[PDB]
Design a protein around this ligand. Structure first.
Ligand code: 6Y3
Length: 283
């Protein structure tokens, strides 16, 4: 838990015009290019889950890379929502794609000397697919994307239902407010599997971790663990196979037999990809 004391970690307040509020960002300056560490489904408003559960700041200190941990956005999928969550009285509309691709990099460039292009997006759970989608649509900003235990095919089959249940359990957020009914084009637009041809076209460097065991982030107490584990395995296998079948050749896949969907294995991946990121972003 957390990193050693004494690191140059700043707690910034970054204005978001689109969301009508300041967004807290934990930041460690260390070079013009940065790793964006996105949080999981249960993202809190006090600290990013990477800081709470791992020594990420410590592990990337003097890496030649800046580290950016945005704080907040529980169940947001770091996306621009159609409207406020109608199930829990959310009093604004999540605009986290706008924040991550416009407002925050503009501010960090002007105030901290961080380049808006040539960065890495690293997500887990909910933000695993987010990281890939950001790379798909903003390749100049993110030539590198890592997805750790992400939702890789959110528009397909039972996934919109399962994601809806998880979002509801994580703070009462409503998936229909986010991307609409499952037939809405927003679901496929934000589906990494569907957007594989974009990742291939951009030659995005992707790093994909698949875990074993029950995805604790949610099944929903109705749903058998075996059912969810089976679906997760098949979806991941389909993603890897489809990436290759579509001409993808810039993807690192990690499926250790012992790996679980947990912070220790997600941190092990973050450490494992450090030299990879240093090479892609800094040469
Ligand atoms: Se990530 C994954 C999910 C389901 C099945 C297989 C995988 C996978 O990545 N397998 C794999 C095989 C060989 C090498 N060198 C890396 C990864």
């Amino acid at each position: 838990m957390f990193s050693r004391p004494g690191l140059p970690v700043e707690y910034l307040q970054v204005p978001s015009a689109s969301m009508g509020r300041d967004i807290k960002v934990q930041f460690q300056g260390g070079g013009p290019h940065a790793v964006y560490l996105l949080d999981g489904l249960r993202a809190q408003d006090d600290y990013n889950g990477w800081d709470i559960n791992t020594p990420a700041f410590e592990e990337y200190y003097q890496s030649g890379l800046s580290v950016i941990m945005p704080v907040g956005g529980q169940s947001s999928f770091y996306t621009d929502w159609y409207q406020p969550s109608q199930s829990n009285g959310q009093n604004y509309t999540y605009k986290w794609e706008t924040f991550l691709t416009r407002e925050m990099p503009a501010w960090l460039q002007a105030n901290k000397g961080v380049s808006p292009t040539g960065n890495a997006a690293v997500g887990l759970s909910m933000s695993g697919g987010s990281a890939l989608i950001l790379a798909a649509y903003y390749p100049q900003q993110f030539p590198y994307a890592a997805s750790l235990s992400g939702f890789l095919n959110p528009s397909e089959g039972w996934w919109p239902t399962l994601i809806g249940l998880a979002m509801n359990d994580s703070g009462g957020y409503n998936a229909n407010s986010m991307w609409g009914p499952s037939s809405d084009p927003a679901w496929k637009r934000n589906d990494p599997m569907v957007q594989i041809p974009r990742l291939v076209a951009n030659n995005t460097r992707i790093w994909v971790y698949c875990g074993n065991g029950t995805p604790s982030d949610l099944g929903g107490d109705n749903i058998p663990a075996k059912f969810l584990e089976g679906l997760t395995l098949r979806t991941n296998q389909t993603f890897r196979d489809t990436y290759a079948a579509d001409g993808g050749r810039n993807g690192v896949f990690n499926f250790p037999p012992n790996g679980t969907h947990s912070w220790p294995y997600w941190n092990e991946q973050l450490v494992a990809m450090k030299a990879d990121i240093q090479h892609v972003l800094n040469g």
